[PDB]
């Protein structure tokens, strides 16, 4: 029974389309966070895991953010910069420019995060709440 939120929270409004999480980022003035994964995979698994079950982050992606999670590529390279891979987490600012300087701590995989990432995830968040003005 196909949902949207696909493992990644139960309790967020997720948007269904890059187009939708646009328009309500530029319009609420919230950062719009696109989490690209796939089901058989299981470091996608072990993350969206971990991120359904931490608070912080779900406080945020429910009332901080407008949340899309998708698995399938967008229309818009700028969400895969450095490669297709998965779990890949990007961050779009209100402005509808792509924050490619908000990273993980792989240099050649810069947007995905592993379970052991997620201090640096929050900090990432928080980072994108820092709108480009």
């Given at each position: ?11 967020i ?9 646009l328009?309500?980022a530029?319009?609420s003035?919230?950062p ?19 991120f359904?079950?931490?608070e912080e982050i779900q406080?945020?992606?429910?009332n ?8 399938h ?8 910069p450095?490669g297709?891979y998965?779990p ?28 052991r ?5 929050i ?5 994108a ?5």
């Amino acid at each position: 029974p196909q949902t949207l939120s696909r493992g990644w929270g139960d309790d967020i409004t997720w948007v269904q389309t890059y187009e939708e999480g646009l328009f309500y980022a530029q319009k609420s003035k919230k950062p719009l966070m696109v989490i690209h994964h796939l089901e058989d995979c299981q470091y996608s698994q072990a993350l969206k895991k971990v991120f359904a079950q931490n608070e912080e982050i779900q406080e945020m992606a429910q009332n901080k953010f407008i949340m899309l999670n998708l698995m399938h590529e967008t229309t818009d390279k700028n969400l895969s910069p450095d490669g297709q891979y998965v779990p890949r987490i990007m961050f779009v600012d209100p402005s509808l420019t792509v924050r490619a300087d908000i990273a993980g701590r792989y240099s050649n995989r810069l947007y995905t995060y592993e379970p052991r990432d997620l201090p640096l995830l929050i900090e990432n968040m928080k980072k994108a709440l820092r709108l480009i003005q």
